[PDB]
Amino acid sequence: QSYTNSFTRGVYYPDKVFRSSVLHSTQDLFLPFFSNVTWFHANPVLPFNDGVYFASTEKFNIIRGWIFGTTLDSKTQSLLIVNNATNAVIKVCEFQFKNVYSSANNCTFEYVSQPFLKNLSEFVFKNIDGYFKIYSKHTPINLGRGLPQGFSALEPLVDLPIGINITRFQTLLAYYVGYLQPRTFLLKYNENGTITDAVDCALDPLSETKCTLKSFTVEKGIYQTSN
Amino acid sequence: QDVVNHNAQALNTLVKQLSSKFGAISSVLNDILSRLDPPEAEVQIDRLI
Amino acid sequence: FRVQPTESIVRFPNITNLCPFDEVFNATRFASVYAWNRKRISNCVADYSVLYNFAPFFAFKCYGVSPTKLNDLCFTNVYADSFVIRGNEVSQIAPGQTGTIADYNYKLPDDFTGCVIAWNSNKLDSNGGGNYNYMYRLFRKSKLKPFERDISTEIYQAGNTPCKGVAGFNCYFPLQSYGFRPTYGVGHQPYRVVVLSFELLHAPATVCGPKKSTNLVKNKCVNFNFNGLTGTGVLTESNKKFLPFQQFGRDIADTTDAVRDPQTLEILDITPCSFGGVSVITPGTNTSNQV
Amino acid sequence: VLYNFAPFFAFKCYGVSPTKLNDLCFTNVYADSFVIRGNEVSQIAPGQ
Ligand SMILES: *[C@@H]1O[C@H](CO)[C@@H](O)[C@H](O)[C@H]1NC(C)=O
Ligand SMILES: *[C@@H]1O[C@H](CO)[C@@H](O)[C@H](O)[C@H]1NC(C)=O
Ligand SMILES: *[C@@H]1O[C@H](CO)[C@@H](O)[C@H](O)[C@H]1NC(C)=O
Ligand SMILES: *[C@@H]1O[C@H](CO)[C@@H](O)[C@H](O)[C@H]1NC(C)=O
Ligand SMILES: *[C@@H]1O[C@H](CO)[C@@H](O)[C@H](O)[C@H]1NC(C)=O
Ligand SMILES: *[C@@H]1O[C@H](CO)[C@@H](O)[C@H](O)[C@H]1NC(C)=O
Ligand SMILES: *[C@@H]1O[C@H](CO)[C@@H](O)[C@H](O)[C@H]1NC(C)=O
Ligand SMILES: *[C@@H]1O[C@H](CO)[C@@H](O)[C@H](O)[C@H]1NC(C)=O
Ligand SMILES: *[C@@H]1O[C@H](CO)[C@@H](O)[C@H](O)[C@H]1NC(C)=O
What is the residue with the minimal CA distance to atom 7 of ligand 4? A106
The CA distance from A128 to A105, in Å, is 25
Q: Which residue of D has its CA nearest to C142?
A: D19
The CA distance from A183 to A31, in Å, is 8
CA of D30 to the centre of ligand 9 (A): 22
CA torsion C238-C243-C245-C246 (nearest 10°) is -40
Q: How far is CA A17 from CA A197, C39, C107, C242, C256, in A?
A: 17, 29, 33, 9, 9
Q: Which of A64, A54, A68, A178 is nearest to A121 (CA)?
A: A54
CA A122 to chain CA centroid, nearest Å: 7
The CA distance from A33 to A9, in Å, is 7
- At residue C198, the 3 state secondary structure works out as strand
- Please provide the DSSP assignment of A91-110 as one string: E--EEEE---EEEEE----E
The CA distance from A19 to A186, in Å, is 13
Cα angle A22, A26, A30; round to 5: 120
The CA distance from D32 to D16, in Å, is 18
Chain C interface, Cβ < 8 Å to B: 64-66, 68-69, 72-73, 230-231, 252-254
Q: Which of C227, C228, C217, C230 is nearest to C268 (CA)?
A: C217
Q: How many CA atoms lie within 13 A of A47 on its CB side?
A: 4
**Best of A3, A4, A6 for a ligand 1 pocket test (most atoms within 8 Å of beta carbon):** A3
Instruction: Answer for the pair C115, C62: CB distance below 8 angstroms, yes or no.
Output: yes
**Cα distance from N-terminal residue to C-terminal residue, chain C:** 18
Q: How many CA atoms lie within 13 A of C135 on its CB side?
A: 15
Q: Which of A97, A135, A140, A92 is nearest to A116 (CA)?
A: A135
Q: Which of C14, C26, C43, C25 is nearest to C196 (CA)?
A: C25
**Sign for the pseudo-dihedral over CA of C48, C52, C54, C58:** positive
- At residue C257, the 3 state secondary structure works out as strand
Q: Which of C106, C191, C98 is nearest to C151 (CA)?
A: C106
| Contacts of C58 by beta carbon, 8 Å cutoff, 6+ apart | C118, C119, C120, C191
Q: Which of C86, C88, C98 to mutate to test the interface with D (most CBs of D within 10 A)?
A: C98
Instruction: Answer for the pair A161, C77: CB distance below 8 angstroms, yes or no.
Output: yes
Q: Do chains B and A touch (3 or more CB pairs under 8 A)?
A: no
- Please provide the DSSP assignment of B5-38 as one string: HHHHHHHHHHHHGGG--TTSS-S-HHHHHHHS-H
The CA distance from C51 to C22, in Å, is 8
Neighbours of C29 (CB within 10 A): 13
CA of C23 to the centre of ligand 7 (A): 10
CB within 8 Å: B35 and C231: no
Neighbours of A179 (CB within 10 A): 20
The answer, for C283 touching chain D at a CB cutoff of 8 Å, is: no
Closest residue to D4, CB basis, from C98, C100, C158 = C158
> Which atom belonging to ligand 1 lies closest to the Cα atom of A35?
13
The CA distance from D40 to D25, in Å, is 31
CB within 8 Å: A18 and C202: no
**Best of C212, C226, C263, C264 for a ligand 8 pocket test (most atoms within 8 Å of beta carbon):** C263
Return the H-helix or E-strand segment holding A179.
strand A175-179
CB within 8 Å: C69 and B36: yes
Tell me the technique behind this structure: cryo-EM
CA of C146 to the centre of ligand 2 (A): 15
Q: How far is CA C176 from CA C31, C100, C246, in A?
A: 14, 12, 51
- At residue D19, the 3 state secondary structure works out as helix
Q: Is C218 exposed, middle or buried (0-12, 13-18, 19+ CB in 10 A)?
A: exposed
The answer, for D3 touching chain C at a CB cutoff of 8 Å, is: yes
| Contacts of A207 by beta carbon, 8 Å cutoff, 6+ apart | A199, A200, A201
Beta bridge partners of A176: A39, A55
Looking only at the bridges linking them, the beta strands covering A101-105 and A94-97 are antiparallel
Instruction: Answer for the pair C66, C174: CB distance below 8 angstroms, yes or no.
Output: no
Instruction: Answer for the pair A161, C40: CB distance below 8 angstroms, yes or no.
Output: yes
CB within 8 Å: D7 and C138: yes
The CA distance from C202 to C216, in Å, is 25
The CA distance from D28 to B38, in Å, is 46
Q: Do chains A and C touch (3 or more CB pairs under 8 A)?
A: yes
Q: After which residues is chain A broken (C to N over 2.5 A)?
A: 42, 99, 117, 173
Instruction: Answer for the pair A12, A126: CB distance below 8 angstroms, yes or no.
Output: no
What is the residue with the minimal CA distance to atom 4 of ligand 5? A138
CA torsion C221-C225-C226-C229 (nearest 10°) is 110
Instruction: Answer for the pair A8, A178: CB distance below 8 angstroms, yes or no.
Output: no
The CA distance from B18 to B8, in Å, is 16
Length of chain A: 227
The CA distance from A124 to D31, in Å, is 58
The CA distance from C97 to C109, in Å, is 10
- At residue A142, the 3 state secondary structure works out as coil
